[PDB]
């Protein structure tokens, strides 16, 4: 009854962070392939 | 189908309920175990010839059996060991899939027909047939705090008051006892025998004649006289129970009227059958019960029942006698399974959160949370059907199937919401349209993932027995997922969702979620523009594709292989070996040093030390021993330095600087059946009757020529014992006849005195027990004692052994071994870093081709499989690729479009090869399965992108570039949703230190990296491949 | 007792010339004995290591050493048919008539296993043919019983 | 596979009721057809060895590995394995007041493995340094050793 | 005690009886080895004489009408009846002296079980019974479960045969109706797309 | 030539311990008589392959003959499927009194 | 399959046979089976062509 | 072969080709077993056979 709250905390923390990380990777690859043209 | 359940949602809810109830009943009726039956079925014939050496035993017992081991079906091989303790072990190994009962029976039957050729001593001791391919579920120990009860007394108490209960427990399949119950030991004295002109033969005969049974009949029995009114069963002399009774036995009566009794000449006691093995628990004498689990059992409830019975019986024990649990791997299993269950639930919570984050609808999140558990429970029911269990491999297949389940749900819900938003349609018609789009895609996905996973079930041996679990688990999960996406999720999206119209829901709402919609729209537009700029010149990116293929091939070649990763099961094993000619004293000194070390310099981590003397796996002799080191719980020892690998290295460092010995510490292998990662097992055989000497010469020569190739081989060594000194007693028959001595009496005296003789049975309080006559330690300990033993001639005079028996020293093998009926020597070795098993295994053949004549070779263990069934992965994966291409051609109705998908296999693969390379892993089973999972996910995303593009091009004529851009725009959202959910549900498996950390990390790394790379690359290269294929054809 | 002598015993037993030289250059004992009384000479002869025998002899290895039961490197060299070992041992003072706790000599051993090339050397080096064992038998009776008439002629 | 088991479970009751001359030779319970799958002949191209010498090789080196192959069931040998064959002469036996029983007893006594025990065995004394298996009497390996039988 | 309690219930239980045999008298014959050795007689010859004379001794086989039959050596009936008939049986000593058993043999009586029963590794006693006419077997089993509850400690009870299976038939039933009802309810809601038609 | 108390400790109880741990065992009884005759009846669950049951019993039994008197082994120990009740009882009679 | 196993086994001692021994197969029923199957397969192919 | 073998004396030498199913014999053949059920003996049974 306390480990699940820890997991939910971990999730609410990382979900947006992991999302921003993936989106930044996508933005970088997009800028790269735009430079390639 | 979906248009049949949207109008009929109660039907779908009913099917879901039925599946849920099935899975619920299954999880109750499912056996739980650490690993399934992986190792091939084997059977061990164990025999014993007390007082014999290796050659006597190999001649009178082993060869005889092996010659009558004919006519047994499905036999892969057999290997025999014959030790100087009289012990024999003939291990037969059958083809996988064989029934371990019918084979045991064929063996027991051939042996039961062969027995009359063995000497009476073996028929009298007992030749047993057991199943070998099992392991101790548990090992219970019993000790006394006070030094009153010794090893044998504890063993007797165990055999009497504890074994029968542990056997009547539920799940307990086999119960072996370490130590032997009481036995009447008769230690004789040669001086006091010659005093009365006696011999051990007289003792033997008297004991045989004065302890036996007698049938004496009845009174008034049939046929009776006419008039009998009474019948009674007669009871004549029966067996003896006490020790005094054995003391009151008459051996002789002198001319002076005196009486000769045992208690005067032979010290009688109540000891054990064998002292060869001595067990200690933290220095305290102990006894043990090894417990192998039964078929279809629950290890957890079984261990609980055992602890409950032993607790019930504790209060009825003597004073100071108590119980302990050295080897209990049940907690490791409990934790490893609880962790996977927690991971499965976290993978649902994360799906909920992700959906609420992108789709602000709660009614949308509710759907996957209902669809995924249904599929997991249906998978449990499917397993229960096919006869599978809840094990490590199955649950790790489930935690990899969750990603496919999540995708199968999220694609549907996302597309339905997308339609409802764009076209302002309501839920029912929006679902109709989305399913019209996605039906064939889901079906082709199902077929593709089947083609990707099924080919693994059809490997050979233990490798295939492992892969079958993952394969069937994931295929069942995916099939139920597809059925669910076609049956239930549409009805749920129709009856639960709410209506929205003409709005991307990103400009009318404020807060974190409005801002997130804004940012996601910006990023989607940027990705669209980038892809649009890409599609104007493609070769610039096909070249990068080729570069990535080359890089991943390089990483694949430079990645080391493996079978399974070692773990921290809460226990490990120390092996003690001594030089040729050691004893119990020195081995126990070394073991006590080991214990003092562990209990002092590892007190912070180690709890107990169970030392068994005279029991090594390389040899069951007297100069060897082991220590089962038990650790505290993973909670009371955090940190790598306090784990089993660091403990092992430190112990080896502290034990290599030791004297006159060889001590090693090692970790309990994953599956007790030792399947190494890159090692082999090479048997060097005598095909010409050369002998032990020439065969040893060839072994030494081969090891020498192998030490000269360290670039491919290393740690090459024999897995046997080297010759030791042996005492030869040459008898002369001329003198034995002159003095009137019977060679039979000579050898009977020698044996019964120095090795031991089992005479007859007696009855203790209840149970029945043996009677062993023997010399006394101080009279059978050196050659100077030989002349202290006398025999009786025919004329009556007594004669000393020294009159007719010369003596010498020689060298002889303590442990002989054979492979398939012919002498052999076992050799071990590893492939040197950077090289594989095939290269070393071929080099050893090249070497053995240069050995003396008559010497040959063969392969055993993993080397057998690896050679017979170790080159069929390419064929089955070619089958897989072909079936996938054909299914994709059917789905897209084209022979070229499928390539657009089958070119994303590398994109994810490399992401798994990088991570596993960085974190320092190998190419093990879990990695091999995460690879296929990531490949399936990538192919899923690509298939939907391609089908969306093609549907737009065909039914709307949008064009190539426009349709492709629209497809990727519509497909971003669900791709990221699935990737994020899966990455999060897996990350704990990567950041893990404790139970199951090895398998957790191996499963999680290669899929985290895989999805990370397949998400941010496939979205770019798939449009490229599609436009390429469509412009070419 | 230093472990150097034990490693020397092991190396002689296993046939390691370089290691034996390395050890003796460090001053290792040669009169060292196993728990049964077998010095490196017994082990090198039993297993047939001529190089090791020569090495150990050059450095003062007692050729007349006897184990706990009267066995000598010559006894083993004769029993197992190591002609070169026999010759080498005798060149350096091997008592060809060495007598054990049972009265058995290299003659009886070489005759029990039919080794004529060795009985020739034993004799011509001064081996008493009439040497009786404990029970009263000699090489002549040991050749008559074993049925080796050739040997009986070699011993008349 | 079950018929064999029932048959042998029934025959394990009769086996004791048989003489020892039948048990020693070994009772077989095979599960096979009544027709030869195949024959495998072995010959000399150099005329060196003869029937007995080829049969011995076949039996001692080839029959046991093939009768363990799967599917065989039964194997018949078109020869016979070696055995120390001892041809008695009644006149020379009467010349020495002997009979076949004397020969049999002498062979059973002087050709025998014996369990002679260990030198340094357990339970040992406090302070023992040596352990060694004892060898007292081994089986015979040639005609020379059989001739010396007294 | 249980049978006595049951004999007070002729309206439920009848024909109650154990499936066993009561303890019986047994005749022990003690052989004194010392006196047989003093008189040159062997323990084995004495055992063989006693066995052959009082219980029979399978000697060997023979051929009757081409069939293999046995050969039994035994005493005449009038010499096996009473413990006073023994003593008429003599033996040959090393010299040949006719030695009677009365010199080295003593006798006594005891009580012992001619048949011992165990159930699941525990000592046990079987009891067979019928249900009284008009009644059933469940009522009788209930009554017997009651009676066996008043018995001393350490004395448990169990059912076998038609009483084991019967027990299952009484415990399977609830789990068989309930499920058979649910599967119906569901099966209806599916066919008639409603949770209410089932509930009616 | 055995008193039931003997047989219940040297044959019966020496086998019963081995038979615990079989796949689908339901219960088992055992009877030791004064003639030495021993009968140990193992009843399994319904649906079991009686042949495989006989087999598993033959397997768990050979673990015990090492511990049984030679007079038990030399007389034979049968492991055979069983039924408590007779199907038929054939009778044979002489009508002319020319036999007993 | 049994004859294949037997030939494979005999192919492991042929290297170790003393100088002079030679294997021969004077009675084998198995080749006839394989050949009678190959001939029917040839028939099937011929019929497809026809 | 059978014709050239009937000209051999003191022997019955017959060559034959094994049937398709060696476990099945001649087409339309019959195997018959005479049995003694009264304790007659081998002699009276031989007489009956003849």
Residue numbers in the entry:
A (entry chain H): 1 to 37
B (entry chain B): 1 to 1033
C (entry chain D): 11 to 166
D (entry chain A): 101 to 250
E (entry chain C): 701 to 900
F (entry chain C): 51 to 150
G (entry chain A): 301 to 350
H (entry chain A): 651 to 700
What is written in the article reporting this PDB entry?
AcrB is the energy-transducing component of a tripartite multidrug efflux machinery that includes the outer membrane protein TolC and the periplasmic bridging partner AcrA. To investigate how AcrZ affects AcrB, we determined cryo-EM structures of AcrB and the AcrBZ complex reconstituted in a disc in which a bilayer of E. coli lipids is encircled by the membrane scaffold protein saposin A (Frauenfeld et al., 2016). Trimeric AcrB cycles through three states in the transport process, and DARPin associates with the subunits in the loose (L) and tight (T) states, but not with the periplasmic region of the open state (O).
In the AcrBZ structure in saposin A discs, we noted a previously unseen, significant bending of AcrZ toward the binding groove in AcrB, which was most pronounced in L and O states. The bending mode is also predicted by molecular dynamics simulations of the AcrBZ complex in a lipid bilayer. Our best model for the AcrBZ complex in saposin A discs is consistent with acyl chain packing observed in the structure of AcrB in co-polymers. A structural comparison of AcrB and AcrBZ when both are in saposin A discs indicates small changes in all three AcrB protomers in PC1/2 and PN2 and TMH 2 and 8. The structure, together with mutagenesis data, revealed that the overall bent shape of AcrZ is being recognized rather than specific interacting residues, which also may be the case for the transmembrane interactions of other small proteins with their cognate partners (Hobson et al., 2018).
